[PDB]
Structures are given as structure tokens and as C-alpha cells.
């Protein structure tokens, strides 16, 4: 339990998201990061060192979300420019630019099959675009305030959505219908992710409480007292033993999904950490933030 690598000045501008692969499809070794400097830096984590491989540009506004396709070595990057641009890590070239106009563009959600791409909508709906089509295939008719967070289950059975007022919308990607609406929070949900087993659902609200609910019966599995600031990002260990939490207080707490206990904490970031993600094995945990430094945390 410590820090392995320390990338200083990883970007000109603050980093708001980090993407790292988990499969063996030339993704776990490369770290894709999206920052407000409009620099989509494809870092190759080769030789246990973070080495820049590509530098993709084109986004008018800062990158808001970054993610790697589970079953594919290509990536994509969105921004508030309403121009979600697909990219390929194999060549460092742009595939297309879905113009999710006029402003309707939010964080991305790679489908486990890597075929559909969900995007939040100011109207409160969740538009589902095709990765190879770029056209609006089908939108989830669950209006409200706005979609702040969208996540795909690793095995693609459920899909949860975080609203501006702590409203979790449990959709069914298998049939594109709203199943449950968990409303155990009143704060804007920042980000959420599915457990590796698609059994637990962690919610990162602005209350500092990690309320881990259940998807099978849409029930709260327990309230966990997190940091003091807002939990920004949250991830599950690929072996599904723990989950890291990124908050707005320069703290990276590795909470135990089973015991709801902080197994370790990092304070190496001088600013707030925006993104945290695991490695393909769960030992290395890459972290980004306003500090503009990528910290690789080793937890053997």
C-alpha cells in the first residue's frame, strides 16, 4: 500500500477524468486522460512507467469524460462542445465526431459489448447513440432535471443514472425500460459505477456518504461515512474486493466494499482528485485531479 509512480505536471490544465484499461486488448497498459487543456493524452503505461504515446486534439472545450472500450482497443472523448469525438488508440486518429448539439453532451458510458454509447441530456433523458452509427438510436424517456452520471454494468444487465437531486434511475439495457428509481439521496449524484458482479451499486453524492444500494431488489445495502468533501469519483477493484473513492478534499480513501472500512488513504495530491481508476489486476490505481499530476498507487 503506497504510491509507485508520480507523474508531475501531467497536463497544462486540470484533469477531470482518467481512463485506464482492464482487459488484455491493448488497453490495461495505456492510460487515456481527459483534461481541460483540450489534450487527450494517450499515455502508454509500459515498463511500469507512464510514457506518452499519442496526443489527440480537436475538442473545442475541455474533456469532461474519458473511457476505454471493454471489448475494443479504441477510445472516445466527449466535451461540452456537443461534439463527442471517437478516437483509436491503435493509431492515435479520430474515428468520427458525434455532434451532440446544441449543448447536449455529458459524460460517456461504454457498453460492455462496446456497441452503444449513452449520453446524458439537459432535458433529463439519456440518449443512446450507436458507436458505429453516431445517430441517436433510442433515448430513455425518464425526464427530470438532468443526467449527471451514467454507468454500464460490466456484464450489461442493468444501467443506473444519477440525477441532479440524488435520483438513481435503474434502467434495463436488455429492454430499454425503467425498472427502479432509487431516491435515497437528495444531493446531486456526481458519479457511480457497477460492482464487478453487477450486484452492488455505489453512489457518489455531494453529502460525503457512500450509500451502496442493491440492484436486484433496489434496496440500500448500507450507509458508509466517506470523506468530508464531495465524493467525485469511485471505482471497484477488478477482483471485487475494495473500491477507491475520489473526493473534493485532496483525499483518496480506499474503502472496503465488504466491511465498509477505510483500508488505506493517500494524501499525495495537493489539489482535489477528480479521477480514480484501478488497473487490470487492481494493484495499481491511477489518479488524476486539479493538481495535474497522475499518481499510480500500488496496493499489493
Amino acid at each position: 500500500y503506497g504510491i509507485l509512480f508520480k507523474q508531475e505536471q501531467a497536463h497544462d490544465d486540470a484533469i477531470w477524468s482518467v481512463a485506464w484499461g482492464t482487459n488484455k486488448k491493448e488497453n490495461s497498459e495505456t492510460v487515456v486522460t481527459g483534461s481541460l487543456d483540450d489534450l487527450v493524452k494517450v499515455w502508454k503505461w509500459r515498463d511500469e512507467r507512464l510514457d506518452l504515446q499519442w496526443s489527440l486534439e480537436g475538442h473545442q472545450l475541455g474533456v469532461v469524460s474519458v473511457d476505454i472500450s471493454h471489448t475494443l482497443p479504441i477510445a472516445a472523448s466527449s466535451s461540452l462542445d456537443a461534439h463527442i469525438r471517437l478516437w483509436d488508440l491503435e493509431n492515435g486518429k479520430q474515428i468520427k465526431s458525434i455532434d451532440a448539439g446544441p449543448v447536449d453532451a455529458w459524460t460517456l458510458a461504454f457498453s460492455p459489448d462496446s456497441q452503444y454509447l449513452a449520453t446524458g441530456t439537459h432535458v433529463g433523458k439519456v440518449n443512446i447513440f450507436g458507436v458505429e452509427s453516431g445517430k441517436k438510436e433510442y433515448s430513455l424517456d425518464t425526464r427530470g432535471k438532468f443526467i449527471l452520471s451514467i454507468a454500464y454494468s460490466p456484464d450489461g444487465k442493468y444501467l443506473a443514472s444519477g440525477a441532479i437531486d440524488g435520483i438513481i434511475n435503474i434502467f434495463d439495457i436488455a429492454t430499454g425500460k425503467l425498472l427502479h428509481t432509487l431516491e435515497g439521496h437528495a444531493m446531486p449524484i456526481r458519479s457511480l459505477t457497477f460492482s464487478p458482479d453487477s450486484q452492488l451499486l455505489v453512489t457518489a453524492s455531494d453529502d460525503g456518504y457512500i450509500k451502496i444500494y442493491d440492484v436486484q431488489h433496489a434496496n440500500l445495502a448500507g450507509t458508509l461515512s466517506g470523506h468530508a468533501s464531495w465524493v467525485l469519483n469511485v471505482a471497484f477493484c477488478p477482483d471485487d474486493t475494495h473500491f477507491v473513492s475520489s473526493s473534493s478534499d485532496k483525499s483518496v480513501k480506499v474503502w472496503d466494499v465488504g466491511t465498509r472500512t477505510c483500508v488505506h488513504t493517500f494524501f499525495d495530491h495537493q489539489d482535489q482528485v477528480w479521477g480514480v481508476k484501478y488497473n487490470g489486476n487492481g494493484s495499481k490505481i491511477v489518479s488524476v485531479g486539479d493538481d495535474q499530476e497522475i499518481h499510480i498507487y500500488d496496493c499489493p
Binding site: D13, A14, W16, L36, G62, L80, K145, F146, I164, P188
Partner: peptide, 13 residues
């Protein structure tokens, strides 16, 4: 503009 985007990032509504 940078700070404006930072602000709108937390809440674009």
C-alpha cells in the same frame, strides 16, 4: 472562460 467552464462543470443547468 476557463473558470466559467470550471463552474459550469459542476452544474451546467
Amino acid at each position: 472562460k476557463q473558470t466559467l467552464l470550471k463552474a459550469r462543470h459542476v452544474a451546467p443547468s
